[PDB]
């Protein structure tokens, strides 16, 4: 066993289901996953240390294993594509995407939770979204998939960026995971019996080697109720950006 630079990276999107994807992929015997978000290419304190530092953060892997890490920030970080390209132009990238409006709500809910833990006030999402639609709200920008995808496609062939349907992963993960295995040239080792639905959790959980487990409590939070009129501004806001994205990647998703 040795440390190797990652042959694939889960690059985002933030709140798209990056942890679920990593854990599920790690069920494969030929996959070695970094346990934590590495934040190599996006944090200057990390990137300035060089690829040698990145290598030290990698899991140890056997000769027939792929090494993977997930850092959700990469996708929406302008500087990151060029840096990854510098490390490895032929790398295979995984991008997991959810409905952009739902992703916005997921993003808000996490930041709300962060504030609650610190006993700090945080405004209802309506306050952040409206001002007309508030275009200064950073979570909106992270859902502009077309805009960010353009930066990546300058450096990487579309064929080397596999898009995981995050909505479908939540509903029925196995078929999505099968496509990831194929994309990565992995043998189809994962099976439907590796997944079981937990009604208490409200999400699918993982079964392997006799051990059963659901994702961390921070994964799968209830979203707030939103003024319907505001939700409609939200859906409308993304309607055209979605069209542009569908044409860019040659694929449509069942989004609002
Ligand atoms: N099996 C699973 N268990 C829990 N959450 C899952 C899941 N599969 C997908 N997810 C999604 O992963 C999201 C978090 O993504 P990330 O790890 O990138 O932050 C969750 O967002 P929500 O908490 O809004 O429901 C949830 O929707």
């Amino acid at each position: 066993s040795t440390q190797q630079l990652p042959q694939t990276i889960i690059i985002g999107v933030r709140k798209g289901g990056t942890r679920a994807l990593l854990e599920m992929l790690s069920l494969h015997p030929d996959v070695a996953a970094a346990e934590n978000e590495v934040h190599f290419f996006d944090w200057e304190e990390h990137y300035s240390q060089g690829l040698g530092w990145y290598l030290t953060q990698m899991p140890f892997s056997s000769p027939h294993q792929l090494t993977v890490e997930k850092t959700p920030a990469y996708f929406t970080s302008p500087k990151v594509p060029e840096r990854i390209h510098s490390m490895n132009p032929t790398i295979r990238l995984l991008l997991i995407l959810r409905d952009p409006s739902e992703r916005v709500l997921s993003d808000y809910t996490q930041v709300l939770y962060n504030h609650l833990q610190k006993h700090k006030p945080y405004p209802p999402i309506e306050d952040l979204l409206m001002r007309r639609l508030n275009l200064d709200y950073k979570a909106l920008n992270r859902s502009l998939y077309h805009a960010h995808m353009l930066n990546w496609l300058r450096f990487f062939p579309l064929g080397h960026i596999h898009i995981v349907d995050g909505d479908r992963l939540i509903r029925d993960p196995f078929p999505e995971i099968q496509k990831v295995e194929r994309f990565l040239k992995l043998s189809p080792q994962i099976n439907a019996s590796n997944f079981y639905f937990n009604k208490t959790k409200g999400f699918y959980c993982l079964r392997d080697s006799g051990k059963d487990r659901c994702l961390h409590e921070s994964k799968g939070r209830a979203h707030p109720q939103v003024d319907p009129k505001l939700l409609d501004k939200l859906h409308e806001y993304f309607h055209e950006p979605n069209k542009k994205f569908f044409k860019l990647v040659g694929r449509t998703f069942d989004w609002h």
Side-chain angles (χ1 to χ4, degrees), residues 1-34 36-44 46-63 65-91 93-101 103-129 133-135 137 139-153 155-181 183-184 186-198 200-207 210 212-216 218-224 226-228 230-232 234-235 237-239 241-242 245-246 248-256:
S1 288
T2 68
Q3 292 177 300
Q4 300 284 319
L5 296 175
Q7 299 90 1
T8 186
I9 302 175
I10 294 164
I11 63 178
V13 68
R14 170 171 166 89
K15 306 316 296 174
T18 56
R19 177 52 69 173
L21 178 54
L22 180 69
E23 294 304 312
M24 291 176 179
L25 179 52
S26 302
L27 292 176
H28 198 288
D30 296 337
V31 165
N36 300 311
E37 299 181 350
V38 184
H39 290 280
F40 177 60
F41 300 101
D42 61 317
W43 291 6
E44 297 304 302
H46 287 174
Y47 190 68
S48 65
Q49 299 194 62
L51 285 172
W53 178 90
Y54 197 32
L55 181 61
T56 74
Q57 300 306 299
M58 293 301 103
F60 285 78
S61 61
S62 71
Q65 278 189 316
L66 293 176
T67 296
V68 58
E69 67 114 331
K70 76 102 172 181
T71 301
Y74 291 167
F75 182 55
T76 54
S77 183
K79 57 186 178 181
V80 165
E82 184 173 352
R83 295 178 168 184
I84 294 177
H85 180 264
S86 287
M87 179 191 70
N88 181 9
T90 62
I91 198 167
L93 301 171
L94 293 168
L95 176 63
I96 185 164
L97 299 178
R98 292 166 70 188
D99 172 273
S101 298
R103 200 224 63 85
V104 166
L105 280 177
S106 181
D107 200 323
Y108 165 87
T109 300
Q110 174 139 311
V111 172
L112 169 61
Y113 170 90
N114 290 347
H115 283 77
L116 294 175
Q117 305 311 129
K118 291 179 169 183
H119 320 288
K120 285 166 59 179
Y122 195 58
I125 195 175
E126 289 85 350
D127 290 13
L128 305 175
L129 282 173
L133 206 48
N134 178 13
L135 302 174
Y137 191 22
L140 282 176
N141 176 270
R142 294 191 284 264
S143 276
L144 291 178
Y145 298 155
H146 176 86
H148 299 287
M149 194 71 184
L150 295 177
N151 302 329
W152 289 86
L153 289 171
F155 291 96
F156 304 101
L158 181 56
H160 286 182
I161 305 180
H162 178 80
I163 306 173
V164 175
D165 189 329
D167 293 347
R168 289 187 174 262
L169 191 78
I170 291 173
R171 282 194 302 271
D172 188 8
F174 180 53
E176 285 297 308
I177 297 299
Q178 282 175 298
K179 296 164 185 297
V180 174
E181 286 175 305
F183 172 71
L184 303 176
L186 292 170
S187 63
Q189 296 297 340
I190 302 169
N191 42 65
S193 71
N194 285 125
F195 306 87
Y196 72 99
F197 188 80
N198 182 314
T200 301
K201 177 70 175 175
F203 289 83
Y204 272 100
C205 302
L206 307 183
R207 174 170 293 119
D212 289 14
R213 71 180 174 97
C214 300
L215 300 190
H216 186 256
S218 68
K219 306 294 176 183
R221 299 187 189 91
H223 298 173
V226 175
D227 180 342
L230 179 59
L231 284 179
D232 286 275
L234 203 52
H235 296 332
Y237 178 71
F238 292 116
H239 192 249
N242 291 348
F245 178 73
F246 296 157
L248 181 65
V249 302
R251 180 175 174 188
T252 57
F253 299 76
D254 192 345
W255 294 341
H256 295 106

